[PDB]
Amino acid sequence: AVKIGIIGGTGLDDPEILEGRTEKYVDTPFGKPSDALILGKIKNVDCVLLARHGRQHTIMPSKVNYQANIWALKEEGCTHVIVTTACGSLREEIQPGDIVIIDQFIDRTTMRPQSFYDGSHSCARGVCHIPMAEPFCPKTREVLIETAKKLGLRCHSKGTMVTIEGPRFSSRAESFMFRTWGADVINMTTVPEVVLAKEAGICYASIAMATDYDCWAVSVDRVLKTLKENANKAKSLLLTTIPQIGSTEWSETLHNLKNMAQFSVLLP
Amino acid sequence: AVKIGIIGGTGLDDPEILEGRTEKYVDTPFGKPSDALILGKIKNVDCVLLARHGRQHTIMPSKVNYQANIWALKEEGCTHVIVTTACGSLREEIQPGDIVIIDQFIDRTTMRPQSFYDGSHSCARGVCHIPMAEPFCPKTREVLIETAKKLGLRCHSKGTMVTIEGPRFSSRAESFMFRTWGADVINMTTVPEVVLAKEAGICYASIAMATDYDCWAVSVDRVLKTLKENANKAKSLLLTTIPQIGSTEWSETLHNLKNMAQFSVLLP
Amino acid sequence: AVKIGIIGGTGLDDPEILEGRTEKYVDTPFGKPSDALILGKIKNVDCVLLARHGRQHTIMPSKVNYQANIWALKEEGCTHVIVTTACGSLREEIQPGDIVIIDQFIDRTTMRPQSFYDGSHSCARGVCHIPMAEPFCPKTREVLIETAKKLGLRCHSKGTMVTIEGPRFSSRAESFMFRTWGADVINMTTVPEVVLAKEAGICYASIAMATDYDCWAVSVDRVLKTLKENANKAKSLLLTTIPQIGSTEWSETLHNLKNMAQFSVLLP
Numbered sequence: 162a163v164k165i166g167i168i169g170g171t172g173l174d175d176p177e178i179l180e181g182r183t184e185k186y187v188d189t190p191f192g193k194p195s196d197a198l199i200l201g202k203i204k205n206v207d208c209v210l211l212a213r214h215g216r217q218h219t220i221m222p223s224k225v226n227y228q229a230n231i232w233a234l235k236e237e238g239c240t241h242v243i244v245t246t247a248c249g250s251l252r253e254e255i256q257p258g259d260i261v262i263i264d265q266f267i268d269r270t271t272m273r274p275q276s277f278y279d280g281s282h283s284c285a286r287g288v289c290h291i292p293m294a295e296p297f298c299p300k301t302r303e304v305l306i307e308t309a310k311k312l313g314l315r316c317h318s319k320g321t322m323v324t325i326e327g328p329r330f331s332s333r334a335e336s337f338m339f340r341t342w343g344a345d346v347i348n349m350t351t352v353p354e355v356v357l358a359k360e361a362g363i364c365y366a367s368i369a370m371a372t373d374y375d376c377w378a379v380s381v382d383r384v385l386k387t388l389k390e391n392a393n394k395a396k397s398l399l400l401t402t403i404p405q406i407g408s409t410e411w412s413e414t415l416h417n418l419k420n421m422a423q424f425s426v427l428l429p
Numbered sequence: 430a431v432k433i434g435i436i437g438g439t440g441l442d443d444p445e446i447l448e449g450r451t452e453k454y455v456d457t458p459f460g461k462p463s464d465a466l467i468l469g470k471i472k473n474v475d476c477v478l479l480a481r482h483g484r485q486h487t488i489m490p491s492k493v494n495y496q497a498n499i500w501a502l503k504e505e506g507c508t509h510v511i512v513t514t515a516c517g518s519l520r521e522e523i524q525p526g527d528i529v530i531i532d533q534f535i536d537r538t539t540m541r542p543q544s545f546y547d548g549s550h551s552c553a554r555g556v557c558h559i560p561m562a563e564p565f566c567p568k569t570r571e572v573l574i575e576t577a578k579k580l581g582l583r584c585h586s587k588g589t590m591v592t593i594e595g596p597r598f599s600s601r602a603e604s605f606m607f608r609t610w611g612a613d614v615i616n617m618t619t620v621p622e623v624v625l626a627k628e629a630g631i632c633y634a635s636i637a638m639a640t641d642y643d644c645w646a647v648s649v650d651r652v653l654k655t656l657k658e659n660a661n662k663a664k665s666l667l668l669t670t671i672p673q674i675g676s677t678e679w680s681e682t683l684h685n686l687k688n689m690a691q692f693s694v695l696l697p
Numbered sequence: 698a699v700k701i702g703i704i705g706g707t708g709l710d711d712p713e714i715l716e717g718r719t720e721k722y723v724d725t726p727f728g729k730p731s732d733a734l735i736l737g738k739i740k741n742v743d744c745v746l747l748a749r750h751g752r753q754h755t756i757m758p759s760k761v762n763y764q765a766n767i768w769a770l771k772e773e774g775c776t777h778v779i780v781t782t783a784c785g786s787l788r789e790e791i792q793p794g795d796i797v798i799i800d801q802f803i804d805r806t807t808m809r810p811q812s813f814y815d816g817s818h819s820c821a822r823g824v825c826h827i828p829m830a831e832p833f834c835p836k837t838r839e840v841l842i843e844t845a846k847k848l849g850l851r852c853h854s855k856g857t858m859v860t861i862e863g864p865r866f867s868s869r870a871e872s873f874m875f876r877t878w879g880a881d882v883i884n885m886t887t888v889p890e891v892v893l894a895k896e897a898g899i900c901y902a903s904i905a906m907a908t909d910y911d912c913w914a915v916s917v918d919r920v921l922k923t924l925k926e927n928a929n930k931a932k933s934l935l936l937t938t939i940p941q942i943g944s945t946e947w948s949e950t951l952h953n954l955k956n957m958a959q960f961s962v963l964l965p
């Protein structure tokens with residue numbers, strides 16, 4: 162049995178995607194999640210939706226409680242966590258409106274807790290050095306890619322996301338530099354969300370939606386406009402992907418993830 | 430009517446530049462500014478001078494209250510903010526003593542608040558994603574460049590400033606790396622000063638004075654020596670530039686800046 | 698007379714290396730050191746050993762009190778501080794088990810105090826801008842290199858260490874990027890340890906032990922395994938190097954270090 166946690170980004174957190182909805186506020190050892198958890202289903206698969214920035218988008222990327230969000234979904238019994246996020250394109254071929262099933266990231270954040278094992282919580286004892294060679298679940302990404310193809314959507318099979326601290330957008334010099342580093346898209350929320358999901362032994366995948374070409378220009382109005390015009394794509398992709406995830410066996414994949422997380426912890 | 434805020438850097442914060450001076454200590458929602466505001470004039474133009482590190486230079490770059498400084502100048506009615514800063518040269522052609530009217534930056538800071546919209550101040554509500562494609566005012570930079578030419582000063586028309594966290598200087602490996610990234614000069618204070626000025630809808634420009642070639646070596650004594658030998662240049666440039674700024678119309682430029690800042694804010 | 702401070706890293710902090718041991722808990726203006734100081738000798742040379750992560754390895758890299766550790770050793774009268782650290786190799790020629798006498802670093806840390814002069818301690822007044830062109834002591838590194846040769850150990854004479862914040866390991870995209878930046882090895886503790894030692898006017902050198910090839914894959918178990926298999930190398934190197942350090946004159950080298958540190962401080 163699988164359970165899909167869904168974290169919705171800016172303008173990509175529609176509750177109506179779930180059938181048989183029930184609101185549920187929870188608490189965690191790391192604090193309160195961005196907003197209430199929305200329990201429901203897509204066909205016969207159980208899901209838990211959560212708005213990353215709150216339903217009214219009042220939380221900036223740097224202040225999102227990534228620890229509480231991931232811990233809450235883990236506590237609900239989620240086996241997978243598929244998220245949505247807007248991003249700027251750093252490559253001509255990645256056009257606004259395109260979907261990118263990212264497989265790598267480059268961290269440019271500075272003031273964000275990236276581990277549950279901070280030495281101050283009894284629920285997470287020891288020092289954890291989680292491997293990040295392959296940050297996103299290959300199997301989950303594969304289903305997303307094939308479903309996008311079945312839907313006939315413009316979708317890139319891989320891509321490197323550079324996550325900046327924000328809330329400001331990048332300068333032109335920074336934008337050029339990121340391209341030379343090998344970054345393909347840019348956002349403000351992938352890190353540490355992907356890191357914490359790995360520590361939790363959860364299958365994590367991200368649906369990145371290009372909304373602009375950054376400035377190599379971007380603005381909040383441009384981002385919001387493109388999201389409004391393309392939100393249906395992420396919704397259709399999730400609706401079609403999830404029942405497919407639920408029809409396959411994940412015990413082995415989840416076992417390997419649990420082992421990796423478990424053996425990354427150094428106890429006294 | 431224009432009003433020029435002037436933020437003086439290390440050894441480039443001479444109060445005598447202003448005529449008819451009056452000291453004024455102020456407070457802001459973000460705390461106290463580095464020191465008192467010095468009100469005065471250059472010809473018929475009103476100005477407000479502020480020492481970035483305090484008159485006795487007791488504040489390190491990472492602890493400067495950039496938010497309070499910019500907010501105080503904005504509250505005084507400043508339409509422009511022209512600053513001075515020492516920097517290391519990362520290019521052979523930029524010689525110590527040279528002035529660089531920088532047009533871009535690369536952020537290497539880590540523990541600095543970069544927005545007024547942090548969710549804890551009623552004076553700045555919402556999430557702000559300010560555009561940084563063109564961080565510095567083109568029109569203000571243009572006047573500085575032409576005035577430098579009229580004065581016959583060695584001045585570079587553009588340049589990318591990499592702002593490091595400090596207080597330590599860069600290692601040789603870091604110095605080499607910054608050159609490959611496309612950085613031309615290096616300092617410790619441009620970011621987030623330039624970011625906050627943009628959020629405030631103020632025309633911001635920076636007079637960077639090269640004092641050394643970093644280590645691709647630099648020392649505090651070398652920096653102080655070069656500043657003492659060349660401080661008169663920044664003073665003469667400001668004295669000649671400001672009356673020129675005051676003789677032109679800025680309502681349209683300021684309107685466009687206000688619009689950009691206003692529409693960068695996401696309200697609940 | 699010399700006194701060698703030794704900071705032992707993960708699995709490279711064996712107390713038995715010292716003869717005539719005596720445990721000593723101390724306090725500093727910056728807080729408590731990672732663990733108690735172990736006083737003792739190697740031949741006729743006085744030494745002070747300190748486990749970076751605590752004897753039971755309960756402190757993550759980002760939470761190590763680098764300020765207290767360096768201050769404690771300085772207060773004990775240490776003239777030199779030679780440390781050990783595990784690291785990942787970013788170059789084919791640097792094989793796991795190899796020693797690298799690093800000479801440069803690239804900072805990728807974000808939430809770490811890098812100076813004693815933070816404006817809140819009477820023991821360290823003013824603003825300090827310490828030079829980092831040559832972060833490690835050349836003379837100390839030279840003795841380590843020659844001793845490694847006399848022992849017939851695979852040892853690299855130089856290398857650039859990129860210090861990441863951690864506790865997570867790097868992503869593959871980050872690993873590739875670090876190689877293009879010119880990094881040779883990667884760890885989580887060199888910065889700011891090397892910076893604070895310089896401010897303290899102490900001769901600092903690092904014995905980096907490659908334990909894996911990062912992911913250009915690494916895991917805690919792989920790291921621990923390689924350290925267990927090669928720990929004897931660092932121990933033998935220290936035992937043979939230290940008596941050699943004690944047989945030479947260091948007054949001039951220490952005087953030059955004291956001058957550099959002293960003149961890096963800007964007083965009110």
Ligand SMILES: Nc1ncnc2[nH]cnc12
Nearest residue numbers: 247248249347348375379
């Ligand atoms: N260009 C951009 N930079 C950062 N985050 C973004 N989100 C959407 N577009 C973005």
Ligand SMILES: Nc1ncnc2[nH]cnc12
Nearest residue numbers: 515516517615616643647
């Ligand atoms: N080389 C340098 N690095 C950083 N800040 C500086 N200010 C002056 N020279 C500098």
Ligand SMILES: Nc1ncnc2[nH]cnc12
Nearest residue numbers: 783784785883884911915
């Ligand atoms: N690959 C690696 N990255 C960071 N720290 C390490 N310590 C040992 N191997 C490492």
